[PDB]
Swiss-Prot record, chain B:
It is found in: Cytoplasm; Nucleus. It comes from Saccharomyces cerevisiae (strain ATCC 204508 / S288c) (Baker's yeast). Keywords: Cytoplasm, Isopeptide bond, Nucleus, Phosphoprotein, Proteasome, Ubl conjugation. One of its GO terms (cellular component) is nucleus. PROSITE patterns: PROTEASOME_ALPHA_1, PROTEASOME_ALPHA_2. The lineage of its organism: Eukaryota, Fungi, Dikarya, Ascomycota, Saccharomycotina. There is a cross-link at residue 190 (Glycyl lysine isopeptide (Lys-Gly) (interchain with G-Cter in ubiquitin)). This is Proteasome subunit alpha type-6. The keyword Phosphoprotein applies. InterPro entries: Ntn_hydrolases_N, Proteasome_alpha, Proteasome_alpha-type, Proteasome_asu_N, Proteasome_sua/b. GO terms for biological process: proteasomal ubiquitin-independent protein catabolic process; proteasome-mediated ubiquitin-dependent protein catabolic process. Gene3D superfamilies: Glutamine Phosphoribosylpyrophosphate, subunit 1, domain 1.
Swiss-Prot record, chain D:
Its EC number is 3.4.25.1. The keyword Nucleus applies. GO terms for cellular component: cytosol; nucleus; peroxisome; proteasome complex; proteasome core complex, beta-subunit complex. The keyword Nucleus applies. Changing residue 51 to N: In DOA3-1; decrease in activity. Coiled coil: none annotated. This is Proteasome subunit beta type-5. It is found in: Cytoplasm; Nucleus. The active site is at 1 (nucleophile). One of its GO terms (biological process) is proteasome core complex assembly. The chain holds residues 76 to 287 of 287 of the full protein. Bortezomib binds at residue 49. The gene is PRE2.
Curated annotation (Swiss-Prot), chain E:
This is Proteasome subunit alpha type-2. The keyword Secreted does not apply. The gene is PRE8. There is a cross-link at residue 108 (Glycyl lysine isopeptide (Lys-Gly) (interchain with G-Cter in ubiquitin)). The proteasome degrades poly-ubiquitinated proteins in the cytoplasm and in the nucleus. It is essential for the regulated turnover of proteins and for the removal of misfolded proteins. The proteasome is a multicatalytic proteinase complex that is characterized by its ability to cleave peptides with Arg, Phe, Tyr, Leu, and Glu adjacent to the leaving group at neutral or slightly basic pH. It has an ATP-dependent proteolytic activity. The 26S proteasome consists of a 20S proteasome core and two 19S regulatory subunits. The 20S proteasome core is composed of 28 subunits that are arranged in four stacked rings, resulting in a barrel-shaped structure. The two end rings are each formed by seven alpha subunits, and the two central rings are each formed by seven beta subunits. The catalytic chamber with the active sites is on the inside of the barrel. It is found in: Cytoplasm; Nucleus. InterPro entries: Ntn_hydrolases_N, Proteasome_alpha, Proteasome_alpha-type, Proteasome_asu_N, Proteasome_sua/b. Its main location: cytoplasm. Pfam families: Proteasome, Proteasome_A_N. It comes from Saccharomyces cerevisiae (strain ATCC 204508 / S288c).
Swiss-Prot record, chain F:
It comes from the Eukaryota. This is Proteasome subunit beta type-3. The gene is PUP3. GO terms for biological process: proteasomal ubiquitin-independent protein catabolic process; proteasome-mediated ubiquitin-dependent protein catabolic process. Keywords: Cytoplasm, Isopeptide bond, Nucleus, Phosphoprotein, Proteasome, Ubl conjugation. The keyword Nucleus applies. One of its GO terms (molecular function) is endopeptidase activator activity. The modification Phosphoserine is found at residue 30.
Length: 244, 233, 242, 212, 250, 204, 195, 240, 222
């Protein structure tokens, strides 16, 4: 019957571990690198694509930066296919909360909601877990700027600066020596590019293989404007900060 | 020693047999002996009960199904506790709707088809109990043997359970005497006790170990116990 | 891999047979039934000195005239005891009379087999049967005091005295010699405490052993720790009288 | 049908009449309108006899289930709010409920809750339900004291039903008294209202309309 | 009678990579060559006919199909798996966007509804991945022309020109050098044929090379006059005569 | 009796030379009692403006429902909703609540940034799309507004003069109706800026 | 029927309710309290149909308390009123419609503002400087139009509420038997025993 | 549906999915519970290996279920939130229908009953979490401290510890906690729980969290400064 | 437009003795103004010394009795042939009556037997559900003709001992089974003359500790 062909993707191992969730972590270590830095007055999200040929039109392309409403953007690392599914369930839950309380969703709710969806598949169902890891950059008046990473376990914790994707270890050690608490949005940009410049597989770092988006409070009246940079602002900011 | 076709009921073996239905038929050869035989006016069940140990009591073996039909189990108790409950309901479903005492023969088939639908499908333990179903309707006395395969048959007398063969031999000889004893319920119970004494492996009949039940042209289904079976040992 | 329904080549359901060994790993329950009442004795078996031993519970009231003792994996018995109070309560609601003991026991045995893989709409509410065995004690006006042993086998016998748990083999050897129909309620209490000491792996004291009786007059009562201390002092006396 | 309950120094007096009618025809004159929920709660049956007869035996089940799981007596507060949730689900399907759930725990003091098929749950100190409720109120409000002897309070209850049974049509039959103490309710016996009338007329001098 | 497969048949092999999406991407590399080029005033998509026999007609088979009047598609991989996915592509375009907003979905939009169909062929239970890769060329009002590739994984990408199938390694090398920014739909047609001539060893009749443009609108195919607001279909599959013209233009 | 006249309200909208206007009253009544004078009836998604009249609770239900579509529309496609596709959208939401609908009369007004055309449309109950280029009206006093507009309006008014025309249409109809009154909002939507004016009127 | 009265001043919302509950011929209680504390800074008075009010006020309260434990945070009164307005909208379409009216009086700590919202049973919330429901509303609104200043201190507001009730006692044809008056300011909720 | 019988008996008589669940709780960070004269104190291990991690917004190990019942946990961080959601739900449900907040023993019996349910439902893997549920019953000041586990059995303890190195902490609590006499006050008890932890944390003032819960709904978290002070005192006391 | 309640007249009477109880009822079965049957019993032996009659609507009545005998069988099969007692059955029939409550049974039911102590016990039901234990209860159409006469000859209501002038209520006795049969027979001869739905024949079922005895009497055919 059906039992013969069954993988069983929800059992414990002989040592009290979940093999299948471990392996989801492994496939996230091949995908492109993504970094987020938290300054006093904004957040930088900066991600390196896995594609780079010139026939590909990377200019209009967005596969790393998504807006969830008008205050919370996420970056993706993992299966880009899988990630679009969780993003529409998040987009919808972010909006339901605005419908029922006429007040923009706290960052803490929208992150805790996505985590439990992922948790859900390893608890029951027998479906294979999700193969995605998010960095949430968002702004709320309660704590100011906030940064959160969640992985395919569903455990999320806040951060001051974090990185998922290739060489997670190497990227964290470069940031750790340089980061300071008095950073402004100008200072953070310069540390983000430089850290991707030291880890990239290819020695050259180009404007076309980088995606980049910030959230700054320099929008008037105590508000926040999310901009996902055009390819012509990235190009100018790579010559300004002296990476090329 | 465990085969390769012992998984679910779906599997056939290359010999052609269904192994899981054969395993449930071994559940009968480890239960306790029980003997049924009928004339043309009385059916009789003689079961040897079984205690667990000394301090223990005895395990019921004869279920009053109605007031003209009753069955005795040999095998797993919870499997019978589903099949005896099901016949009760099907006997009420006839008296309610058609106002007809459910004919014994028709109740056998109804039971059979309920066993079949659990060996066709995946999942579903096959029922591991063998019943003898006696009863008296408009066509006279009837005694059925129900295998866990599902096959029901009509007999002048049978037995099931551990070392039943010694009793079933005594019924093949004396079949021609006890079949003609009509309008005399005492002697027909006497022939049934003697049958089951041939199957004992020196357990010894006792007044608390034996259980008899009769049903006839004029009697309701009634079970004798304890002091009531002292006259019949 | 085997299903959960599969028979062995002998004709026994694997899970139901394996389940019996889970009972052997449990703590000791002793039950002696007399013509004046039934006495229930249990080894609480604290696992540390920090563990508070009073919160542990192995005797529970079902109704004022039915009490229950547990041996095995005892969190499964949370589910069995909940069914029992409903059957016993729902049955006093429909017919204005307390259930028999013999009928209540059978309702919990029907419940026991319910394991499976699911088919159509039909509930199967376990994957494996209840990994716990129960000693249901109680009293009705019809058949005096009774004591039952309901196993996940799906079969129950009425017993004059049974003992299950870690010390089942050696405990029931002592009962077979010591029991007779003429025990009173105060001799059975000392007889349970004597057998509870032979199979116990600790020191016998008031904190880690519990007694319970069932009389018609007073219902089902769990002895406080104070009363149990007096009976423990009264055992040491009859063994030094000799 | 006239039932009243009122708090006092010693607990609660519950007094109920007895007569149950169908129009002109008087069906029956002995109706235990007081339902023994358990040994510590009393429920009164007023209005639609079926609804309150059935759903307060069911309520005694949920009290004895909650007493075994938690191992403590059940609040009067909790017992009433089990019952307002039951009749609220059925609302508009047409049932009629009019009860006083009366109990006396140590932590609350003597308490009454009055549950209605509208879905109303009221805490209170004097209640009165039924057709004659207005007559019972009159005698009860003028002679009510928080401090009252147990003799005088039994006798005040008995008089509130008599005052109603005389003027209103449907009530009549017989008076029942109950005294809810801490240990539970004690039943203070049945008094025929025909023989009672001449007794009260004699002692106090009350009632002059009637020549008798 | 019952379905009792609810568990994924796609698991993570112990070194990442979902085993079944790797394999399916190999059956997409066995398929027949297919390629597409984007210009500043159109898009061309072209593929080669494969013939079971000389008895089999080939005009009856559609290997290029319409999704909406402005978005056409062409595949590489398995024939059966593309047929059912084009029909599920038209329903979900009409039911969650045509009725609800009136106009026909934008091209960005439509690719995402088709990518959710693919994705849920591994997350869900009992199934295996579609054995096809799509190219989707189309035209929306606020971003011009665009060209997309939707892989059996679910990932999509905008390209300027790409190829897939067995001659995909050779074809994309040639297109890398030949493509420019200024291009006519007439010039691109000449590049699309020239490449696909190297990849097909079989007969190169204009019967058996199916080419289709998402160029500009046809007042003639609209079917009705007198509404200057409505415009014709931008898609147009070319007939066999017209393709024989551009061959003699090599 | 009718659900529309329990709470009242009136919306009107015109076009001119490259601009639209849209106006309403602020009163919110429960039949004879007047409750509030700050109840806005006009809500706006990006550069589309939507006036709703009728039963006051449907107004607030439809105002959170369209904010939900145009937000989710805006994130996925990455341009604001356009007035032409918004008309289709309003109509399809109402229509799936076919039986026992919202008791409303929406008016869509907004300059299409694509073509530059000013554009208006009105709806009613189930979801009938009233297409006009002249003026659109809704609400209790729809008969009275029709009279004012038709004699006042003339094709192509510059923005400063269209403000004079639509004030008189709203202000004279309202004073001759019982269930509309206090305060009035006129929005002059030009192609870049939006000017919002509150008008002095009779507070009886 | 009932009377529920809400007046907002410089730094307080004052709510008043009727002490009486009449089911049929008789007045049954004269001390009943028709108001539930949702939160440390939000009070909600309710009134309307028999038996339905009590069930729908305990419901709202459980959801608001659950949110407070779940995020460890207090919802502003702005957010609370939009939640209550959502629940009434649902019921009127559903099989069994509620008929309840509510005034939600609260002190937002983020803004240092008192706020008062009135939600009638259709599902129409409006923010006001003072509200009422029923036939009691008809008699109050015309005093408030005349005496009310937006800069009044808490102690004058109570002197204006003594005047509103005195007008009701003279004209309503139903007893209500005085009122329970409650204040919500920045220190929490305290009930003034005087009328 | 998906209903495979994930959990079955082995012939040794233990469920292998439940033994595997309990090994998972061993690798978890360490949480300790000790109840004084009239307080409870829950001490928890913060993994401080991490750097550049903000502590302001990061979920703690102590999550309040009600205003007088707190819950701590060891095991899988992700699965833990699933118990705490059903618990916050159960606490308001019990307030709604019976009135009166939940008593600590009842809130455990619910939570322990959920972990038991997921060991019979076909298609579900067991939970990898063991909790300490602590607090004060309403209108009483007896401290109560309970432990559940993925078998579903629950017990009250005078002191307890779950998670990694638990044998070393438990040994220290069997010597330093007199069962008759609790830590005299609230201040002595905190000094007993910190001193137990400093054996297996190998110090770090930032590593240790202390939450104290007192009668009458007083939950307070001791700040970093306070913790540091206590550690320095104990270190200096013990050092001396 | 279906009206699902019919009527079939008929009357029933239950008297509780000290060691016996009777349930009697007339056998005439009408619809409107036609007599349908002379002889049609309504009083049934249900086993266990219970007698039961549901009188009123004959189709809902016959059905209620079929389901009750179905509940007596199932009582035996589960609790090992413990005899349902009249006290028990009462709370049970309350659960069948109440099980419909939005298309109810439209019958007036009476059951009678001996309770634990061994004294006659009658229970009387309402269609909607509730039930009360009585000493004497009539039911059906002519119930309001027989009740008052019974209150005067059993309970001695409104009768005073002679020469005390209303100051000593008349002393009460116990009734013999022979005497009660004569009361019921007089009732029903009276009943026939003045009410148009009683007659053809009266059947009394007497329940003693020895079993159930039937007795059949002729009334007037007109």
């Amino acid at each position: 019957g059906s039992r013969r062909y069954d993988s069983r993707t929800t059992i414990f191992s002989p040592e009290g571990r979940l093999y299948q969730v471990e392996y989801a972590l492994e496939s996230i270590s091949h995908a492109g690198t993504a970094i987020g830095i938290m300054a006093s007055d904004g957040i930088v999200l900066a991600a390196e694509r896995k594609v780079t040929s010139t026939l590909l039109e990377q200019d209009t392309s967005t596969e790393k930066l998504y807006k969830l409403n008008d205050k919370i953007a996420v970056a993706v690392a993992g299966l880009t296919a899988d990630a679009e599914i969780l993003i529409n369930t998040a987009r919808i839950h972010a909006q339901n909360y605005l419908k029922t309380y006429n007040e923009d969703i706290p960052v803490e709710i929208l992150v805790r909601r996505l985590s439990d969806i992922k948790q859900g598949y390893t608890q029951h169902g027998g479906l294979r877990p999700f193969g995605v890891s998010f960095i949430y950059a968002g702004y709320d008046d309660r704590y100011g700027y906030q940064l959160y990473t969640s992985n395919p376990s569903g455990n999320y914790t806040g951060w001051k600066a974090i990185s998922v994707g290739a060489n997670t270890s190497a990227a964290q050690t470069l940031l750790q020596m340089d980061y300071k608490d008095d950073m402004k949005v100008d200072d953070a940009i310069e540390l983000a590019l430089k850290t991707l410049s030291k880890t990239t597989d290819s020695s050259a770092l180009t404007y076309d293989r980088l995606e980049f988006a910030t959230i700054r409070k320099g929008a008037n009246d105590g508000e926040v404007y999310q901009k996902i940079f055009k390819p012509q602002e990235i190009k100018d900011i790579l010559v300004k900060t002296g990476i090329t | 020693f465990r085969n390769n076709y012992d998984g679910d009921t779906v599997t056939f073996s290359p010999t052609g047999r269904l192994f899981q239905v054969e395993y449930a038929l071994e559940a009968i050869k480890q239960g306790s002996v029980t003997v049924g035989l009928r004339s043309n006016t009385h059916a009789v069940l003689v079961a040897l009960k079984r205690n667990a140990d000394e301090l223990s009591s005895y395990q019921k073996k004869i279920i009053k199904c109605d007031e003209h039909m009753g069955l005795s189990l040999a095998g797993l108790a919870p499997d019978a506790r589903v099949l005896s409950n099901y016949l009760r309901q099907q006997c009420n479903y006839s008296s309610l709707v058609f106002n007809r005492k459910l004919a014994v023969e028709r109740a056998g088939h109804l039971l059979c088809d309920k066993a079949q639908k659990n060996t066709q499908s995946y999942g579903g333990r096959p029922y591991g109990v063998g019943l003898l179903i006696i009863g008296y309707d408009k066509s006279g006395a009837h005694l059925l043997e129900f295998q866990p395969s599902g096959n029901v048959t009509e007999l002048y007398g049978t037995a099931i359970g551990a070392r039943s063969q010694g009793a079933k031999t005594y019924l093949e000889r004396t079949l021609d005497t006890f079949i003609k004893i009509d309008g005399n319920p005492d002697e027909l119970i006497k022939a049934g006790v003697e049958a089951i004494s041939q199957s004992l492996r020196d357990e010894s009949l006792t007044v608390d170990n034996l259980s008899i039940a009769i049903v006839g042209k004029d009697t309701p289904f009634t079970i004798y116990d304890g002091e009531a079976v002292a006259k019949y040992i | 891999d085997r299903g959960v329904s599969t028979f062995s080549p002998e004709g026994r359901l694997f899970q139901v047979e394996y389940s019996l060994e889970a009972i052997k790993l449990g703590s000791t329950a002793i039950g002696i039934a007399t013509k004046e009442g039934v006495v229930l004795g249990v080894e609480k078996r604290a696992t540390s000195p920090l563990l508070e031993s009073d919160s542990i519970e192995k005797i529970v009231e079902i109704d004022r005239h039915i009490g229950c003792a547990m041996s095995g994996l005892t969190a499964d018995a949370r589910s069995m005891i909940e069914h029992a109070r409903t059957a016993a309560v729902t049955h006093n609601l429909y017919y204005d009379e307390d259930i028999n003991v013999e009928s209540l026991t059978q309702s919990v045995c029907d419940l026991a087999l319910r394991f499976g893989e699911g088919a159509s709409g039909e509930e199967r509410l376990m994957s494996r049967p209840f990994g716990v065995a129960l000693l249901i004690a109680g009293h009705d006006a019809d058949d005096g005091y009774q004591l039952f042993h309901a196993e996940p086998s799906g079969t129950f016998y009425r017993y004059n005295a049974k003992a299950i748990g870690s010390g089942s083999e050696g405990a029931q050897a002592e009962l077979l010699n010591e029991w007779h129909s003429s025990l009173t309620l105060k001799e059975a209490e000392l007889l349970v405490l004597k057998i509870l000491k032979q199979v116990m792996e600790e020191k016998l004291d008031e904190n880690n052993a519990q007694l319970s009786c069932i009389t018609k007059q007073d219902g089902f009562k769990i002895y406080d720790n104070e009363k149990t201390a007096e009976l423990i002092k009264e055992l040491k006396e009859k063994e030094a009288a000799e | 049908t006239t039932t009243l309950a009122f708090r006092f120094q010693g607990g609660i007096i519950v007094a109920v009449d007895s007569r149950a009618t169908a129009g002109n025809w008087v069906a029956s004159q002995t109706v235990k309108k007081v339902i023994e929920i358990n040994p510590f709660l009393l429920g009164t049956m007023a209005g639609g006899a079926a609804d309150c007869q059935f759903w307060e035996t069911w309520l005694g089940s949920q009290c004895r289930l909650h007493e075994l799981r938690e191992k403590e007596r059940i609040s009067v507060a909790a017992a009433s709010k089990i019952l307002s949730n039951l009749v609220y689900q059925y609302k508009g399907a047409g049932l009629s409920m009019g009860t006083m759930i009366c109990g006396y725990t140590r932590k609350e003091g003597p308490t009454i809750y009055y549950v209605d098929s509208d879905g109303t749950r009221l805490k209170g100190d004097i209640f009165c339900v039924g057709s004659g409720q207005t007559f019972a109120y009159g005698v009860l409000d003028s002679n009510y004291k928080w401090d009252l002897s147990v003799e005088d309070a039994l006798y005040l209850g008995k008089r509130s039903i008599l005052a109603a049974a005389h003027r209103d049509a449907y009530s009549g039959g017989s008076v029942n008294l109950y005294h809810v103490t801490e240990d539970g309710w004690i039943y203070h016996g049945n008094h025929d209202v025909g023989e009672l009338f001449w007794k009260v007329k004699e002692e106090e001098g009350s009632f002059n309309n009637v020549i008798g | 009678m019952t379905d009792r497969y609810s568990f994924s048949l796609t698991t993570f092999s112990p070194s990442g990579k979902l085993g079944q999406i790797d394999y399916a991407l190999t059956a997409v590399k066995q398929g027949v060559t297919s390629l597409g080029i984007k210009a500043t005033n159109g898009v061309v998509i072209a593929t080669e006919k494969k013939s079971s026999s000389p008895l089999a007609m080939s005009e009856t088979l559609s290997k290029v199909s319409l999704l909406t009047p402005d978005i056409g598609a062409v595949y590489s991989g398995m024939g059966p798996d593309y047929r059912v996915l084009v029909d599920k592509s038209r329903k979900v375009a009409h039911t969650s966007y045509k009725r609800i907003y009136g106009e026909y979905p934008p091209t960005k939009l439509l690719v995402s509804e088709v990518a959710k169909i693919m994705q849920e062929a591994t997350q869900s239970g009992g199934v295996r991945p579609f054995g096809v890769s799509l190219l989707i060329a189309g035209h929306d009002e606020f971003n011009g022309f665009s060209l997309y590739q939707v892989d059996p994984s679910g990932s999509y990408f905008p390209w300027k020109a790409t190829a897939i199938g067995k001659g995909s390694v050779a074809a994309k090398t040639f297109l890398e050098k030949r493509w420019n920014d200024e291009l006519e739909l007439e010039d691109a047609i000449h590049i699309a044929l020239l490449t696909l001539k190297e990849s097909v060893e079989g007969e190169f009749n204009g019967d058996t090379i199916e080419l289709a443009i998402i160029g500009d609108e046809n007042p003639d195919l609209l079917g009705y006059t007198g509404i200057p607001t409505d415009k014709g279909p931008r898609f147009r599959k070319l007939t066999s005569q017209e393709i024989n013209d551009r061959l003699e233009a090599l | 009796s009718d659900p529309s006249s329990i709470n009242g309200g009136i919306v009107v909208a015109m076009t001119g030379k490259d601009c639209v206007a849209i106006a309403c009253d602020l009163r919110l009544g429960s039949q004879s009692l007047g409750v509030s004078n700050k109840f806005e009836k006009i809500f706006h998604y990006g550069h589309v403006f939507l006036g709703i009249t009728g039963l006051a609770t449907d107004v607030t239900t439809l105002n959170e429902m369209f904010r939900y579509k145009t937000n989710l529309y805006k994130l996925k496609e990455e341009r604001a909703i356009e007035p032409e596709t918004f008309t289709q959208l309003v109509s399809s939401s109402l229509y799936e609540r076919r039986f026992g609908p919202y008791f409303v009369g929406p008016v869509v007004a907004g300059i299409n940034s694509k073509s530059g055309k000013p554009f208006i449309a009105g709806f009613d109950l189930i979801g009938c799309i009233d297409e006009a280029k002249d003026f659109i009206v809704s609400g209790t006093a729809s008969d009275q507004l029709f009279g004012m507009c038709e004699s006042l309006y003339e094709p192509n008014l510059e923005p400063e003069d269209l403000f004079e025309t639509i004030s008189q249409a709203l202000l004279n109809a309202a004073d001759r109706d019982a269930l509309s009154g206090w305060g009035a909002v006129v929005y002059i939507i030009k192609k870049d800026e939006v000017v919002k004016r509150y008008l002095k009127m009779r507070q009886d | 029927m009932d009377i529920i009265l809400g007046i907002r001043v410089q730094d307080s919302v004052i709510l008043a309710s009727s002490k009486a509950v009449t089911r049929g011929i008789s007045v049954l209680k004269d001390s009943d309290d028709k108001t539930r504390q949702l939160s440390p800074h939000t009070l909600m008075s309710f009134a309307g149909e028999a038996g339905d009010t009590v069930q729908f006020a305990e419901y709202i309260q459980a959801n608001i308390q659950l949110y407070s434990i779940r995020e460890d945070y207090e919802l502003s009164p702005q957010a609370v009123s939009s939640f209550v307005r959502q629940e009434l909208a649902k019921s009127i379409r559903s099989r069994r419609p509620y008929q309840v009216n509510v005034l939600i009086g609260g002190y937002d700590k983020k803004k240092n503002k008192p706020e008062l919202y009135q939600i009638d049973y259709l599902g129409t919330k409006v923010e006001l400087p003072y509200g009422a429901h029923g036939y009691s509303g008809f008699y109050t609104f015309s005093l408030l139009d005349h005496h009310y200043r937006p800069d009044m201190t808490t102690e004058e507001g109570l002197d204006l509420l003594k005047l509103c009730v005195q007008e009701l006692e003279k004209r309503m044809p139903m007893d209500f038997k005085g009122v329970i008056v409650k204040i919500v300011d920045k220190d929490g909720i305290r009930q003034v025993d005087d009328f | 549906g998906y209903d495979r019988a994930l959990s079955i008996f082995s012939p040794d008589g233990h469920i292998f999915q439940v033994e595997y669940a309990l090994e998972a709780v061993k690798r978890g960070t360490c949480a300790v519970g000790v109840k004084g004269k009239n307080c409870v104190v829950l001490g928890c291990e913060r993994r401080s290996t991490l750097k550049l991690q903000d502590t302001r917004i990061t979920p703690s190990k102590v999550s309040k279920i009600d205003s007088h019942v707190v819950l701590s946990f060891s095991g899988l961080n992700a699965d833990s939130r699933i118990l705490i959601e059903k618990a916050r739900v159960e606490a308001q449900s019990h307030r709604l229908t019976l009135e009166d907040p939940v008593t600590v023993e009842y809130l455990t019996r619910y939570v322990a009953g959920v972990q038991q349910r997921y060991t019979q439902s076909g298609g579900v893997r067991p939970f990898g979490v063991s909790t300490l549920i602590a607090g004060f019953d309403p209108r009483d000041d007896e401290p109560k401290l309970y432990q559940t586990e993925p078998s579903g059995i629950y017990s009250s303890w005078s002191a307890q510890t779950i998670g990694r190195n638990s044998k070393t902490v438990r040994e220290f609590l069997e010597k330093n906690y007199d069962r008759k006499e609790p830590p005299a006050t609230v201040e002595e008890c905190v000094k007993l729980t910190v001193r137990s932890l400093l054996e297996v944390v190998q110090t770090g003032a930032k590593n240790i969290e202390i939450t104290v819960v007192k009668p009458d709904s007083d939950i307070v978290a001791l700040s970093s400064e306070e913790i540091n002070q206590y550690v320095t005192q104990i270190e200096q006391e013990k050092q001396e | 437009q279906f009206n699902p309640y019919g009527d079939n007249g008929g009357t029933i009477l239950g008297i509780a003795g000290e060691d016996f109880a009777v349930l009697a009822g007339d056998t005439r079965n009408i619809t409107d103004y036609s007599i349908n049957s002379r002889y049609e019993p309504k009083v049934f032996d249900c086993g266990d010394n219970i007698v039961m009659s549901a009188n009123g609507f004959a189709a809902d009545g016959d059905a209620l009795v079929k389901r009750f005998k179905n509940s007596v069988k199932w009582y035996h099969f589960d609790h090992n042939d413990k005899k349902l007692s009249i006290n028990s059955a009462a709370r049970n029939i309350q659960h069948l009556l109440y099980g419909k409550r939005f298309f109810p049974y439209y019958v007036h039911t009476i059951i009678a037997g001996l309770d634990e102590d061994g004294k006659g016990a009658v229970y009387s039901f309402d269609p909607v559900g509730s039930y009360e234990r009585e000493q004497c209860r009539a039911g059906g159409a002519a119930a309001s003709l027989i009740m008052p006469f019974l209150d005067n000859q059993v309970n001695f209501k409104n009768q005073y001992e002679p020469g005390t002038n209303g100051k000593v209520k008349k002393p009460l006795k116990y009734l013999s089974v022979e005497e009660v049969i004569k009361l019921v027979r007089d009732s029903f001869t009276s009943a026939t003359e003045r009410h148009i739905q009683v007659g053809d024949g009266l059947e009394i079922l007497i329940v003693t500790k020895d079993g159930v005895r039937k007795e059949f009497y002729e009334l007037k055919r007109d």
